[PDB]
């Protein structure tokens, strides 16, 4: 398909991986009596293995000759859920986290003793800040455009050149 890879739902070596995993769990299952809790645990592991391989085979994932799913990350939408959309989810969270941390830093400078606020967190104020992060891109961009995010170079300490 892409890059000569085959879909996992028709790959014979993907089926060989699934069969090998199922037999490897079943040979452990063979040594326990039916109804024993290890037997139930092993059968649950077999069910999870079968469900995982079934789910992976019907997802449009591409499998190489090894028998494992291979991710496509060139920007194409047919694999846009493999790298692009989870990454944006991280981009949602991480841009949240730094922003609320930045907000707390701007709060902490205004206190009587900032370092005590640094080691001993103001928990209601911190919870307010971590609540504020849900609209972080627009808030951060408005902070940037109003000159409150970037400071000029003449107010930052630098070493002698």
């Amino acid at each position: 398909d892409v890059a000569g890879l085959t879909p996992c739902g028709e790959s014979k070596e993907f089926a060989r991986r699934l069969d090998g995993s199922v037999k490897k769990l079943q040979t452990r299952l063979k040594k326990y009596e039916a109804g024993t809790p290890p037997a139930l645990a092993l059968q649950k592991q077999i069910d999870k293995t079968k469900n995982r391989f079934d789910r992976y085979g019907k997802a449009g994932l591409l499998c190489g000759t090894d028998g494992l799913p291979h991710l496509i990350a060139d920007g194409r939408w047919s694999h846009s859920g493999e790298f692009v959309i989870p990454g944006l989810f991280f981009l949602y969270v991480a841009g949240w986290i730094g922003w609320v941390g930045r907000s707390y830093v701007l709060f902490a400078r205004t206190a009587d003793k900032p370092t005590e606020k640094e080691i001993i967190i103001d928990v209601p104020v911190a919870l307010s800040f971590v609540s504020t992060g849900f609209i972080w891109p627009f808030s951060a961009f408005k902070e940037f455009t109003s000159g409150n995010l970037i400071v000029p170079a003449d107010e930052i300490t630098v070493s002698p050149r």
């Binding site: 003449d154 930052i156 300490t157 002698p160």
Partner: protein, 60 residues
Amino acid sequence: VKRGSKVRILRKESYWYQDIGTVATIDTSGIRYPVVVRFEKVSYSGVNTNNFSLDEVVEV
């Protein structure tokens, strides 16, 4: 510059170069560095005050 003012440091070798301090005392005698400036950030040696000349301090 005067007593109480916030000043920026233009001494290149200083730890607080382009940072803001508060003037604590201006000596009137013929001292090369008569402006005592106290800083909120401590240096690497743990001090937070230093003497500077008139041209090494600019009011903000």
